[PDB]
Amino acid sequence: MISLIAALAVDRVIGPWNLPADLAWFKRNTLDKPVIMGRHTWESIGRPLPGRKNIILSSQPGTDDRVTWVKSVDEAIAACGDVPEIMVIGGGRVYEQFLPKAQKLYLTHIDAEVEGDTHFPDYEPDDWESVFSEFHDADAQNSHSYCFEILERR
Ligand SMILES: [Ca+2]
């Protein structure tokens, strides 16, 4: 099964905060699972996420032997093999391709209105059921209030 995970500010801007807690959530949800990303996302991360299989989506040839390079959405899924759940880590463009096939979403709603580039694709209220929610305020470490949510395709 295919799963998308994203950290969204207000108005689904994914495109200012310092949320160690979210990185803690992100890591635990992805550990030991294939991670699919677009080249731009790969580029900002800058090194492979240790303990996951890293699959990069690009139209051109791979430039780094530390991850697996693929040329289509289909090949990306084939590269994962037989695992229970595949995690789509972004960005915008990969979100939009993967959304229609995703069965689960893992979101963090950050209270931070920013003017941004990429929005998380609109998902239909009707296709999703929230099966987990957990609200947390800003504290020492975390700069903003945020909410962990998990949705499932009904
Ligand atoms: Ca990203």
Side-chain angles (χ1 to χ4, degrees), residues 1-114 116-121 123-154:
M1 137 206 110
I2 298 166
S3 274
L4 268 58
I5 183 177
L8 284 41
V10 146
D11 298 323
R12 336 201 231 64
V13 158
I14 55 180
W17 64 71
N18 177 331
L19 303 182
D22 173 62
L23 283 188
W25 157 266
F26 167 101
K27 180 148 236 83
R28 99 161 141 271
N29 289 303
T30 70
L31 231 345
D32 301 324
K33 299 175 206 166
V35 293
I36 309 179
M37 65 188 83
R39 198 250 346 218
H40 300 309
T41 294
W42 163 236
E43 288 201 358
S44 4
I45 278 180
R47 51 108 203 228
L49 297 175
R52 284 151 261 182
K53 183 198 208 189
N54 295 227
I55 297 141
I56 323 319
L57 212 10
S58 177
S59 78
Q60 303 316 96
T63 66
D64 186 321
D65 289 295
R66 274 169 310 157
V67 300
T68 298
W69 297 80
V70 306
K71 309 197 144 106
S72 57
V73 159
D74 276 349
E75 218 192 325
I77 288 160
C80 297
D82 244 58
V83 306
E85 149 171 82
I86 297 157
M87 298 308 297
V88 182
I89 82 171
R93 234 269 216 167
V94 170
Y95 285 144
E96 257 162 12
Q97 288 180 82
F98 283 84
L99 199 107
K101 305 154 132 97
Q103 279 294 324
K104 193 134 108 168
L105 301 178
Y106 290 82
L107 317 173
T108 324
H109 309 272
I110 324 227
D111 190 77
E113 249 192 327
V114 248
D117 98 339
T118 25
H119 292 226
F120 180 84
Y123 48 93
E124 124 156 321
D126 236 339
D127 315 322
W128 317 80
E129 155 165 37
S130 157
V131 309
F132 166 96
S133 218
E134 190 185 88
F135 177 79
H136 297 266
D137 247 7
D139 57 21
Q141 300 206 87
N142 306 295
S143 70
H144 297 90
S145 69
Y146 55 93
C147 184
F148 298 123
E149 180 169 40
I150 315 166
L151 307 100
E152 301 169 8
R153 196 75 102 160
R154 329 170 144 313

